[PDB]
Symmetry: D3
Subunit: 276 residues, 6 copies
């Protein structure tokens, strides 16, 4: 009931002739949150590990030692966490801290044991986890949804009306590379990251969830800015966006997504704004 799959990096040239089924296998995590299970992807775009943890009966922990060539999961890595599901808790080295819906956590490198548990097994917590390599330990921090700063953005004419939530951000805190945020599109607005960009020096992974209706789908565009493809996403699915690719998506209704960013810098304005 634990799975971690490996995905290789590619050039723009390599994917040019991929069909939709090949694009989907290569860039799309089709199953993230499943009850009782840990589902993870390891991408060779900056060695990000991401997935979800949905504990029910037994408490769930990510135990990786020999698999990463290390003594314990976070020995050389750091970790972001956001709970998009029901009420639950994570205990960090024995200190149990409760996490409600949309509560975040940062866990710095060197932290040896993090255990994921849910309060009500029939409405469990869904922990979206993103781990990146780390050379420096920074203090663990809880990012409450309560104290999270909501910023409305976008207008109705451009169909981008949304609320942006800072979670793991170099302005509020210090991390090695990982950055994470939360974006809720208002009803009647489906476009995300519409003015698009390719930041060569970092990559992003988007995970789309909280779909308005079970019938909504999101079309995520990726690819070189002149050559764009799209992947159609159902609820609680994610797509990896390499450094050379634009990352944007359009919905049939409103939805929400978590983006995770990493690379060799945290500076937000290094991107090249994009004609496609």
């Amino acid at each position: 009931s634990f799975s971690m799959v490996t995905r290789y990096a590619h050039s723009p040239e390599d994917i040019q002739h991929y069909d939709t089924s090949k694009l989907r296998h290569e860039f799309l995590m089709e199953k993230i949150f499943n009850p009782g299970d840990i589902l993870l992807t390891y991408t060779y775009n900056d060695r990000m590990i991401f997935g979800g943890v949905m504990p029910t009966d037994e408490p769930l922990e990510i135990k990786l030692s020999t698999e990463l060539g290390v003594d314990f999961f976070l020995q050389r890595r750091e970790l972001g966490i956001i709970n998009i599901g029901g009420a639950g808790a994570i205990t960090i080295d024995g200190r149990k801290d409760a996490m409600s819906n949309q509560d975040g956590y940062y866990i710095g490198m060197g932290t040896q044991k993090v255990v994921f548990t849910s309060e009500d097994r029939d409405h469990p917590a869904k922990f979206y986890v993103v781990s990146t390599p780390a050379h420096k330990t920074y203090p663990n921090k809880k990012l409450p949804f309560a104290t999270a700063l909501a910023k409305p953005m976008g207008d109705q004419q451009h169909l981008n009306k949304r609320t942006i939530y800072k979670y793991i951000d170099a302005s509020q805190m210090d991390t090695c590379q990982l950055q994470m945020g939360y974006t809720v599109l208002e009803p009647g607005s489906s476009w995300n990251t519409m003015p698009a960009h390719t930041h060569a020096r970092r990559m992003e992974t988007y995970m789309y969830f909280n779909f308005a209706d079970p019938e909504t789908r999101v079309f995520h565009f990726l690819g070189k800015p002149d050559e764009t493809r799209h992947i159609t996403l159902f609820n609680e699915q994610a797509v990896v966006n390499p450094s050379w690719s634009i990352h944007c998506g359009v919905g049939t209704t409103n939805y929400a997504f978590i983006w995770a960013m990493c690379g060799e810098n945290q500076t937000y304005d290094d991107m090249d704004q994009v004609n496609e």
Copy 2:
């Protein structure tokens, strides 16, 4: 100048590995309205001819005989016309009839002379024209935008809020195969054909009246499981084979004229 370019039909399998540059060449007409010229595409998806006529100083007529193996353009064909530009007139066999903005016209099989004129050379008429093969002559008809029937459709939740305008429609008139309509998405809505594949008919969409110059429309095609997209600037058109779905999304609101033909005038409802 006059231009008519030819485009072949394809299988879904044939297009599966096309890169963006080849899809664009194959399914996308990138220049439709240019001043003084008539620009046309002939697609082997049901032999539709479509394009634009922008007369300014010299009246423009589509002169086709030997190219179509026929004595004059409309001997075996019918013709739709919609004016998306300035005020103008079409003279049908010497009879000049004025066409205001968004005025439509249908011209049945057998009409030997259609010449396009514009009122103001500096605000010319832009005539979007669609011709399909026709075996029966039906009366020519003027379709004023004034008397056209607007139908409100869509909500804000699904971002499809729009007004539907029937122009050449089998309920309002009789044509062999050709059908044409006009759809204006209200501000805050970019989705068109929010539902599909009609295996028994094909469609060509021409997008125009972009709200802002920065607007772009992403039109999806392909069988529903393997979908590709072409990104469109203002005043461009894309052909939808019978086997492909019809979708488009703008970054803002926009308008498009659809033109349909096929084996009937009467559709089955991704990745």
Copy 3:
């Protein structure tokens, strides 16, 4: 015992690298007349429907309404029919009309029911049928073999010596689109369409039959005149020739074929002859 398959149209570039098995699947109908069955093809080259209704005794009907988005098969289409087999019958709106060998029939737009029957189950009828979309009803007409003008053509030096028979022809009849003909090569001549002639404004389907002996084969050439491929045809097989392709064939012996043409014009002089090079 009724079958209709769909086949998509293509560009020349699309087929340039097709292998031989792909060419056969895309352009070739491998079975037309089968006992008890009706087999049909729908080509996206001008939406021609062609095939055969090869009964045993009483039932055969083409049930197409919703599949074509219409109330009945011929509401928006017309239909040509040739009997290449034994004596049989088609019933038009309840009116049963018997068909001898090589008798033709045309049925205009709007005719609501046609049912195919044969007398002897052991000497059955083979009905070759071609339907194209139609916007105008035209009179049904009988194409008798007795009064069918035989037109001799070709010499032995060019191995094209043959008899040409007009059936559905714009000089003798009125149709929306469809045209059909019948050609019997004399023994010692197998070549058909000696200059190749691509006509951009219409397409053709060739159905080859009446092979001299069971071992004969016909090689049907297609493709742009510079890049030509060929499909090897057994008896009672058909090949779709898109507007952009030459249509040629040579047999190892004599044979016969029905050609069916449709498109946006009926003009026979609108073609580009391909001079003898390839």
Copy 4:
């Protein structure tokens, strides 16, 4: 104006996706007989050398030593010759023997000098030449059109009616590997040949200027065709069928070699 081109062999699998121009480049010799010239192709299907020599003003000899890794052309090879044009002669080591139209010749391994001449420069001899590697010297022999045993075959119903002329045939004579013959379809017949061995066909004597021959090659299930003008040649590897059909009648010289005679 001496030419020899190299062409590699292939598997059936290799050609499956060749376009028309590629098959022609790989399997089709487009110019064989040009006045005054020798034109040759070296194919890696059994290292057959074939082409034509059309002497006009100057006598012509195929001079190959270093390129074939030998001291003279025929040191390790043998040579067949058929003259499809006007009267001529070959002087073999100074001994001149006249070659009329459709005269044959075999020249065994070890013969150092073959010189091709024609009487009239304005209706020259056309020498179609085929050479195969040879391990044993056999006598040089003239193969007259008269004494070349003709075998009639085919009927009009099958449009294959022709007379087959054996020239170099293991029944009348001995060679290392090479076998060569001459086949003329009668008027109103265009079909030809409706193996340890390969074949090279050179089609000529087209009835009318518009005649074309479609030569089929490939495995029996996957067949292609090449379109042939007059005086052109096509190689058929061991794994390929050998077929052709013309728009009129014509002639061809076949040359075969391989692991059996």
Copy 5:
């Protein structure tokens, strides 16, 4: 005359049908040391930057701020340096340190200015440079060739006879992810890393130089252990080895190479060496 070219990562599948010119373009840095120039590759295999700095007349420095989206080259990165050419010096923030032949250097995250100079313009220093992303400052260290620690290895029977030189090694020093070493093959031995290893969690870049005679070539094998390709190497050229690929080489004669390693761990035991079945 500063160059940094970008090279993308690939799947094993992606390269399977690469022809010889394509393999070279994707995996081979063909020119590293040229007089007066800085030549660099940025590879999306763990974002390693490598190349050479060969100063002659004018002092040379790697100046990157906006291109990497940072304030200075080393703000988020660390830097290894080994001088394979003549005597020269690197001045770190104005503080000049001399660099003799085969002298090494490590420069930790945060040092703002490193300037490479050569003593004699006609026999310049050839500085091989390797930079990896770095989150933690560690002390700069000079690694003199004099005090380097050699380990002889291999026999003549396996043609692997060689001497190994520790330069940037977690035993002598602490770095974020970079590791670097130097290996000189004895005459009569051309094989490097012969029993071949994959380690999924780290990648390697090899730069081969000091070829015994001008005619020698090195054949570097890469690819999955079942599907292996090779690139043919002249003197002073380098090859990038993805985490999924083996690292091998054979010369027609002896030679030397510098290896540079990084990844998400520094543990050398993490690799799983493939038993000898290849292709």
Copy 6:
């Protein structure tokens, strides 16, 4: 239990995009010597037949008549033989002649019956056999390992130190086309045919055997000099090298190989040397 597989010729272009699995299928005979069996490959590069005959319980003969379109195997062909295994014998038309380890034999065109036997069932002879088309009968000849015609070649710096043994050679003997030799690399040298050559008028097949250790591997390079590939070999495997391809190999240890050559000439200097630039 007789096998002969057929392999077609190719152009350089044809193989340029072959993957590893395809090259092996086209150019590599993976099993040659198996107890009790005849294993053979027919290549359309000059129609060479090669393989192995390992008699144990019953006598073995190569019976090919109608398959090659002849009455008996050698009617149009000649045959080279070298025994790399245990003690054995070939009986030529009833005349039994013994063959020890590394004993050779040439058998000319027209010999109707060649029968292979082994002395000890459990230490069988491994007869490596090579047949080429032949138009002329030449005398059968036994080629004892005793009279070796041995000769050392190469130096230690180039790792080619080796012994060359002439077997079927046009200076000592007369054959139609076939030429065969045996080359033993001394321990501490693995390179064969290192200065590499391509001869349009001849092709070669290498069969590698006597690997020093069970883990030894040989990397055989083939292809046009600019576009080169390689196949990695176990012990007792063979590789076909078309006229347009280089012939090279490197071992992880020493080994031996038997080369067999044919073509339209026997000239040993008709070849093109490859200057060391090969991509």
